[PDB]
């Protein structure tokens, strides 16, 4: 009530002009020249800033607040998605570590670095469920599984916000994108999402609720329609669900120009009506389009909105600012005015140990023919491909304040790891695409992709000549980070054709071929699975990616990472995901649910990933065959390292309700342990199962466990498991 | 109440054993040997038969009924989808005619032929909305548009059932598949369907309701889940919607083994519980698995079901049998006991005139560089490809009693059309697929696909040598009918790789290249659009396909057919459909990077909805609305003048689309709301007048309120969904 008292008496001091000013979130750009923005801050007409990311620059803004009547401090936000200055792997890569503590360490250090530069808030975590590999932004999520994405959503929020949001090394988590954004039709970004309420509540919503339950201070609203209604004008989503049902008590933030876009959605004929829909639906804070400042006064004058609409939004902004401690000290994350200046991008402000150690855990070994990996640090190694010496790509999309020049490439990683003991030979081999239209797209806003001016044939001859000089080729191939961005939807999930032509040429030299993959989404790797001697999935592995990849290639680390998203054989099988419904005619037969013109199932399933050692599980044992209401069951299995090398695997518990009021999925992830074992080491794993893990949203959204059979699965991926059954009473 | 009285007094006479017997629908096969089935009919334990399709064979069954106590007649059903013995184009092809009377003529003659053979019912029309070209069964539907599929659903039902269901040349329409079956995830057949109730009511359901409103005597229930609940156990779908809300008064029929499959759906641990869910959800008649006969007695004994559950289903079966006139004369479609025997597949029992005249209307001219088509009947024409001399494929999937041997191939069609005036040279050029696994699948039960024992290279050399001898190549390519069947879902929408290798070789000879396409779904034709000199979409055009294709190729007919389903550039763009939502960041075909689009391919469809070329040129005058305000209960007039401004007689389809740019839901960028197909002679002009009222402006909102909101409405008019002009009015 200290906070309630403080807020109530500040808002009793405030005019509607000052209140509406608090709802305005802007960045320096064409729409808002720097100096007219500073003038707006001095006049009490700006609530917050995004995309201003250095102490001197953020100090300069907060300094303008003393000129306003009430001196209400700004908060400063940025897209700290998977690192601020020290870049960790893209979220899809982090998820692949299957280790909350690893994911937490990336968020803690992100918060530490961003706070240290003056930032109060990150538009993070992105926790949208993704079953469509075509979608540009799958790189920003944690994959396709509801349980894993929901858990890591909670982990990220608690790591960022820490023990106290006032703390100088804590930032506010603004979870995104609320809601259902990953389910765009055709995987086209911003596009229509349409689904049943049972699927919505069971599969897609839980990650947002986890962020709320973990204490997320903010929620960012999505650009997409939900069953005909844009989320930004969806009163049901933002008021009935978010506030009245989940009990969210924080700040709602519009997406970039999302209020104005209600016109193109066909929900409003003009900006006046677009504003009314958004504030009355439950959008507090308006990003960039400034429709709130332009129209909220006139809507109130004409009775089209209530004072309570303005007050709800303003109180939310002030409560956020309060919990960040900005009313106690606006400069608590900006040092002291007499502090000596520093180089923001100084080497000593980075966390390279952390980045390298996190980057190792998420690398996924997909293929290793006749123990080719790990490599010895001897002989001549050809390092070939357009992503081998790429600093821009290895830090991935949404790379915040990450500096390309400070990033360790895959080539450099190998250079450092072999020293003078092996000879590395380099050849680019191909451009990332051989299609000038795709190169035009990738280089459209910024020059993201360095184009060799030579012919494909010239580059291939040079690559072939390098392979011939070498004992083995390490091909570094896949996507440029510009291919797994916002709006970068693909019709083709394969490696680009220029690089596939390179890989076939390289295969034909007869040299052992190791594939180091870079990608922000599941790829189509039919050919690579038949032909490559080994494949390593490195996603975009960040600032210290090259070192972490070199550590795994030379056996300093044993690949432990496993997929959190199913890899389709082709884009034609989209969507494919492990927790699908059985249907009345499950494919194992001509008259089953399947394609005829391709092998069925995914190439690599959910939970899949190889190691340099071999693991075994003892028989699955349940503590009983009946479970009483309010009692707790124990699934017990013994994991061994039955190979020669130390290493980690992930023991995954799945669950099936084979008889239910709805057709339930064939299995759903409900627990896991990542376990490091020395050779011969054994760990008894014990899973606790209760009524909470058996529940689902029925036809009428009743969240219920029904009595009857439950099947418990345990294995090292969703494909290779054993089941044992019990009964709920 | 004559019927109600009759039924009430029959059912008062009946035991539960006799009532449960009426719910049993079976076919002769492994599961039911012919003679044990006849014994079951005599014992009053069979309600109906499917897949028995000749008079002598159907007579033999109905003869067994006199041995039952109450002598309740059987009805006999079959899959008369697009013809019985004389096969018309696949439904997707029929839709492309944009002509109710053409679609009606195919259904009338289907009913006539099937009734003439003894059949009472067809599991038809299939009226499932299809936005996913990967799905095997898009060939059986009318495309992606709700308005067109809803209209043709009504047309098909009224054609089949005629003026009286008692009539000897009328059959009962059993509309399918209720419901949402075309929206399977991944386009994998039988697979999960999951959608909002606004999309369901606005886009997907109306065709089923049209069948009901047209007086469909029966509805067949789908195999797919709807939002977690199999349609077969979906009480909401079959009771609350179908009966209580739409007022359906006919018979519900399960799909093949659909009750038992509730176990694999994970809705039931056993057959006892699977039966209870299905009969209590509102499934009257049980197809093949016989769970109803095995379990309904014990469920009733133990109180797990009510007598009213049994009675509802039985009364429905009897009402269907009554309206077919089978209680007045079980042999009314089986002739008289004296009647002389005949050859069922006699040439004189076919309707070749009708099939040829219907097949012309749906052929779609996609490309015609420098008026190559129509061809003259002179010189040397190379006819190359694996579908050129294919009889089995041209009759398509769900070909009922259609005989391959009786079908006119594309080669034969051209042979008849040129007689002795031109030289046709033949070469197969490639096998339908070059993948032995796909050939194994296609030839798995029956040999559907003739594999040439020569090498691809040998066939290519022979094809190339034929092209060299010729003035122009007519390449006959696309899918085998086994590729657009039930469960034949594809990951690739292109022409098979063996035929694409053939087309590239042929292109490289420099000879004019005409593509005759055969397919049961939208194909990916990026390459063919850049490289072929002309493209003709022939779908599967049926028994008289070859003749109808030859008529269009030689200008006897002017291509009038237009697409009812959007053609994607690649499978990676699935789904693509004209009536999509704008989104908050629409791409402007002034491209932006941050719009709703793919980056690694051209965006939009290759060919849009309503698209199709002609041998002549048409013009439209400016669109004129009768006013700029429309009063509640009043009627607006959109008026345009269509001309033949070219040298040949021919038809086009003038299409009216509608947009509600401001609404409580984001509405589609446009929705089809009317059309005229118009034949014009050169220089001929016709003032077209569309009537628009409040009914055409309505939509299902967040809470399924079906209303027109006041405000702006935009009217579009053009010869396809791409190339239109708009004018606005206001509702008050
Ligand atoms: O710049 C901040 C925001 O910009 C928007 O364009 C994106 O949709 C958000 O996800 C992002 O966090
Ligand atoms: O063969 C009769 C019926 O069998 C079902 O399995 C099919 O799905 C229906 O379309 C068909 O009409
Ligand atoms: Mg149960
Ligand atoms: Mg309106």
**Do A570 and B492 make contact, defined as CB atoms within 8 angstroms?**
yes
| Separation CA B174–CA B220 (nearest Å) | 6
Cα–Cα nearest to B483, from A599, A572, A595, A589 = A595
| Separation CA A305–CA A291 (nearest Å) | 14
The answer, yes or no, to whether any atom of ligand 2 lies below 6 A from the CB of B729, is no
> Mutate which of A261, A278, A434, A583 to disrupt the B interface (most B C-beta within 10 Å)?
A583
In B182-286, which ranges are continuous DSSP H helix?
197-199, 206-213, 235, 271-281
Q: Is A290 helix (H, G, I), strand (E, B) or coil?
A: coil
What ranges do the domains of chain A cover?
1-350, 351-614, 615-729
Nearest atom, ligand 2, residue B50 CA:
2
**Do B575 and A186 make contact, defined as CB atoms within 8 angstroms?**
yes
Q: Is A347 helix (H, G, I), strand (E, B) or coil?
A: helix
A134 touches chain B (CB under 8 A): yes
| Separation CA B374–CA B371 (nearest Å) | 7
Residue B311 annotated as binding site: no
Closest-CA residue of chain A to B497: A597
CB nearest B667 (choices: A195, A258, A266): A266
| Separation CA B213–CA A157 (nearest Å) | 55
- Is there a contact between A93 and A361 (Cβ–Cβ < 8 Å)? no
Place of tokens 């156990």: B233
Radius of gyration from C-alpha coordinates of chain B: 26
Cα–Cα nearest to B28, from B43, B39, B17 = B39
The answer, yes or no, to whether any atom of ligand 1 lies below 6 A from the CB of A232, is no
**Do B185 and A664 make contact, defined as CB atoms within 8 angstroms?**
no
Experimental method: X-ray
Write down the CATH superfamily of domain B618-732: Immunoglobulins (2.60.40.10)
How many contacts does A have with B, using Cβ atoms within 8 A?
267
| Separation CA A195–CA A229 (nearest Å) | 12
A342 backbone dihedrals φ, ψ, rounded to 5°:
-150, 160
Cα–Cα nearest to B268, from A12, A126, A582 = A582
The answer, yes or no, to whether any atom of ligand 2 lies below 6 A from the CB of B256, is yes
Radius of gyration from C-alpha coordinates of chain A: 26
In B435-557, which ranges are continuous DSSP H helix?
436-442, 456-468, 497-507, 526-531, 545-553
- Is there a contact between B86 and B354 (Cβ–Cβ < 8 Å)? yes
Task: Give A 534-573 residues with CB within 8 A of chain B.
Answer: 569-573
Task: Give A 469-488 residues with CB within 8 A of chain B.
Answer: 483, 486-488
Q: Whose CA is nearest to atom 5 of ligand 1?
A: A256
Cα–Cα nearest to A493, from A520, A469, A522 = A522
CB nearest A227 (choices: B196, B230, B492): B196
Which tokens sit at B577? 């459909």
Which tokens sit at A203? 């599969």
Q: What CA–CA distances, in Å, run from A83 to A97, A122, A130, A160, B473?
A: 16, 10, 21, 11, 61
Other Cβ atoms less than 10 A from the Cβ of A565: the count is 28
Burial of B440 (0-12, 13-18, 19+ CB in 10 A): exposed
Burial of A87 (0-12, 13-18, 19+ CB in 10 A): buried
Other Cβ atoms less than 10 A from the Cβ of B484: the count is 28
Which tokens sit at A106? 């990336």
B492 touches chain A (CB under 8 A): yes
CA terminus-to-terminus distance, chain A: 45
CA atoms lying within 13 Å on the CB side of residue A263: 13
- Is there a contact between B173 and A173 (Cβ–Cβ < 8 Å)? no
Nearest atom, ligand 2, residue B486 CA:
8
CB nearest B227 (choices: A198, A571, A708): A198
Pairing label, strands A225-226, A229-230: antiparallel
B658 touches chain A (CB under 8 A): no
The answer, yes or no, to whether any atom of ligand 1 lies below 6 A from the CB of A45, is no
**How does DSSP classify residue B52?**
-
Closest-CA residue of chain A to B262: A584
Which tokens sit at B472? 């122009």
> Mutate which of B600, B605, B730 to disrupt the A interface (most A C-beta within 10 Å)?
B600
CB nearest A593 (choices: B190, B570, B572): B190
Pairing label, strands B24-26, B48-50: parallel
**Do A571 and B569 make contact, defined as CB atoms within 8 angstroms?**
no
Place of tokens 């569309």: B690
What is the CATH T-level fold of the domain A615-729, as seen in this structure?
A: Immunoglobulin-like (2.60.40)
| Separation CA A720–CA A251 (nearest Å) | 44
Q: Hey, what's the torsion of the CAs at A129, A131, A135, A140, to 10 degrees?
A: 40
CA of A628 to the centre of ligand 3 (A): 14
Nearest atom, ligand 1, residue A177 CA:
10
Q: Is B130 helix (H, G, I), strand (E, B) or coil?
A: coil
Contacts of B597 in chain A (CB under 8 A): 188-189, 487, 489
Would B1-350 and B618-732 be classified into the same CATH topology?
A: no
- Is there a contact between A612 and A555 (Cβ–Cβ < 8 Å)? yes
**Partners of B193 in the beta sheet?**
B226
**Do B262 and A584 make contact, defined as CB atoms within 8 angstroms?**
yes
Strand order in the sheet with B724-731: B629-630, B724-731, B711-718, B650-659, B671-680
Q: Which helix (H) or strand (E) holds A35?
A: helix A34-42
**Do B228 and A582 make contact, defined as CB atoms within 8 angstroms?**
no
**How does DSSP classify residue B265?**
T
The answer, yes or no, to whether any atom of ligand 1 lies below 6 A from the CB of A256, is yes
Cα–Cα nearest to B550, from B418, B392, B420, B648 = B418
Q: What CA–CA distances, in Å, run from A78 to A158, A373, B609?
A: 18, 40, 44
Q: Which helix (H) or strand (E) holds B426?
A: strand B423-427
Nearest atom, ligand 1, residue A140 CA:
10
Q: Which helix (H) or strand (E) holds B217?
A: none
CATH architecture of A1-350: Alpha-Beta Barrel (3.20)
- Max intra-chain CA distance, chain B: 80
A444 touches chain B (CB under 8 A): yes
Q: What CA–CA distances, in Å, run from B73 to A295, B26, B50, B59, B551?
A: 74, 15, 14, 11, 46
Contacts of A264 in chain B (CB under 8 A): 582-586
B191 touches chain A (CB under 8 A): yes
Resolution of the structure, angstroms: 2.8
Place of tokens 């401001």: B662
**How does DSSP classify residue B434?**
S
Closest-CA residue of chain B to A440: B599
Kindly provide the residue ranges of all beta strands, DSSP E only, lying in A292-411, ordered along the sequence.
Answer: 364-368, 380-384
Closest-CA residue of chain B to A698: B228
Q: Which helix (H) or strand (E) holds B141?
A: none
B369 backbone dihedrals φ, ψ, rounded to 5°:
-65, 120
- Is there a contact between B189 and B487 (Cβ–Cβ < 8 Å)? yes
The answer, yes or no, to whether any atom of ligand 2 lies below 6 A from the CB of B562, is no
> Mutate which of A593, A658, A667, A707 to disrupt the B interface (most B C-beta within 10 Å)?
A593
| DSSP secondary structure string for all residues of A416-437 | HHHTTSSEEEEE--S-S-S-HH
A122 backbone dihedrals φ, ψ, rounded to 5°:
-120, 130
**How large is the angle between the packed helices A55-62 and A34-42, nearest 10 degrees?**
40
Cα–Cα nearest to B157, from B167, B165, B148, B168 = B165
Contacts of A658 in chain B (CB under 8 A): 266, 269
| Separation CA B676–CA A668 (nearest Å) | 52
Which tokens sit at A243? 């506030």
Which tokens sit at A240? 């009935």
| Separation CA A571–CA A525 (nearest Å) | 11
- Is there a contact between B529 and B535 (Cβ–Cβ < 8 Å)? yes
**How does DSSP classify residue A720?**
S
CA A539 to chain centre: 12
| Separation CA B300–CA B298 (nearest Å) | 5
Burial of B566 (0-12, 13-18, 19+ CB in 10 A): buried
> Mutate which of B134, B187, B228 to disrupt the A interface (most A C-beta within 10 Å)?
B228
**Do A581 and B223 make contact, defined as CB atoms within 8 angstroms?**
no
Contacts of A483 in chain B (CB under 8 A): 599-600
The answer, yes or no, to whether any atom of ligand 2 lies below 6 A from the CB of B123, is yes
């Amino acid at each position: 009530t200290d906070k309630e008292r403080f807020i109530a008496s500040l808002m009793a001091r405030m005019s509607n002009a000052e209140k509406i000013g608090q709802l305005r979130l802007v960045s320096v750009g064409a729409d808002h020249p720097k100096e007219a923005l500073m003038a707006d801050i001095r006049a009490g007409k700006v609530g917050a800033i995004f995309n201003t990311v250095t102490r001197p620059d953020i100090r300069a803004m907060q300094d303008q607040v003393r000129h306003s009547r009430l001196k209400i401090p700004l908060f400063h936000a940025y897209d700290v998605a998977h690192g601020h200055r020290t870049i960790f792997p893209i979220s899809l890569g982090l998820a692949a570590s299957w280790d909350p503590e690893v994911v937490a360490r990336s968020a803690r250090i992100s918060a530490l670095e961003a706070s240290a530069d003056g930032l109060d808030m990150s538009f993070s975590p992105m926790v949208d469920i993704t079953r469509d590999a075509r979608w540009g932004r799958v790189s920003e999520g944690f994959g396709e599984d509801t349980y894993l994405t929901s858990l890591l959503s909670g982990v990220m929020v608690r790591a960022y916000q820490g023990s106290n949001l006032a703390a100088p090394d804590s930032i506010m988590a603004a979870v995104k994108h609320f809601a259902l954004y990953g389910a765009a039709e055709g995987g086209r970004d911003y596009n229509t999402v349409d689904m049943s309420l049972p699927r919505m509540f069971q599969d897609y919503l839980p990650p947002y609720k986890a962020a709320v339950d973990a204490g997320a201070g903010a929620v960012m609203v999505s650009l997409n329609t939900i069953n005909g209604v844009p989320a930004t004008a969806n009163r049901w989503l933002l008021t009935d669900l978010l506030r009245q049902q989940w009990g969210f008590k924080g700040l709602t933030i519009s997406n970039h120009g999302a209020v104005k876009e209600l016109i193109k959605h066909g929900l409003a004929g003009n900006e006046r009506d677009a504003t009314r829909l958004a504030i009355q639906a439950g959008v507090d804070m308006n990003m960039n389009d400034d429709l709130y400042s332009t129209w909220l006064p006139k809507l109130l004058a004409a009775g089209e909105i209530d004072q309570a609409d303005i007050d709800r939004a303003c109180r939310d902004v002030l409560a956020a600012k309060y919990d960040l401690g900005l009313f106690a000290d606006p400069y608590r994350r900006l040092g002291k005015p007499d502090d000596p200046p520093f180089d923001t991008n100084a080497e000593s402000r980075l966390h390279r140990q952390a980045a390298r150690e996190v980057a190792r855990e998420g690398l996924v070994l997909l293929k290793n023919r006749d123990g080719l990996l790990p490599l010895k640090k001897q002989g001549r190694i050809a390092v070939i491909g357009p992503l081998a010496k790429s600093q821009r790509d290895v830090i991935g999309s949404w790379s915040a304040a990450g500096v390309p020049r400070q990033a360790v490439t895959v080539y450099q990683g190998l250079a450092n790891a072999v020293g003078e003991r092996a000879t590395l030979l380099y050849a680019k081999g191909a451009n990332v695409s051989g299609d000038q239209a795709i190169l035009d797209y990738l280089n459209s806003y910024n020059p993201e992709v360095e184009v060799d001016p030579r012919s494909a044939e010239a580059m291939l001859e040079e690559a072939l000549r390098t392979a011939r000089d070498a004992d083995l080729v390490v091909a570094v191939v896949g996507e440029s980070q510009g291919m797994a961005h916002e709006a970068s939807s693909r019709t083709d999930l394969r490696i680009p054709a220029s690089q596939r032509r390179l890989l076939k040429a390289l295969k034909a030299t007869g040299k052992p071929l190791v594939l180091v993959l870079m990608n922000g989404r599941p790829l189509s790797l039919g050919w690579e699975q038949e032909n490559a001697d080994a494949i390593l999935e490195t996603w975009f592995s960040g600032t210290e990616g090259g070192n972490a990849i070199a550590d795994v290639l030379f056996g300093e680390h044993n690949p432990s990472g496993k997929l959190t998203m199913s890899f389709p054989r082709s884009v034609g099988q989209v969507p494919v995901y492990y927790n699908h419904l059985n249907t009345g005619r499950p494919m194992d037969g001509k008259y089953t649910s399947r394609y005829f013109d391709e092998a069925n199932g995914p190439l690599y399933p959910f939970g899949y990933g190889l190691s340099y050692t071999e693991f075994s599980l003892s028989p699955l044992r349940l503590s009983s065959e009946r479970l009483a209401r309010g009692a707790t069951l124990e699934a017990r299995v013994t994991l061994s390292n039955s190979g020669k090398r130390a290493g980690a695997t992930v023991v995954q518990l799945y669950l099936q309700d084979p008889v239910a009021s709805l057709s339930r999925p064939v299995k759903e992830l409900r627990g896991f342990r990542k376990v490091m074992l020395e050779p011969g080491e054994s760990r008894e794993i014990v899973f606790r199962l209760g009524e909470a893990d058996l529940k689902f949203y029925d036809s009428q959204l009743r969240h219920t466990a029904e009595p009857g059979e439950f099947k418990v699965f345990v294995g090292l991926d969703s494909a290779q498991t054993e089941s044992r059954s019990f009964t709920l009473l």
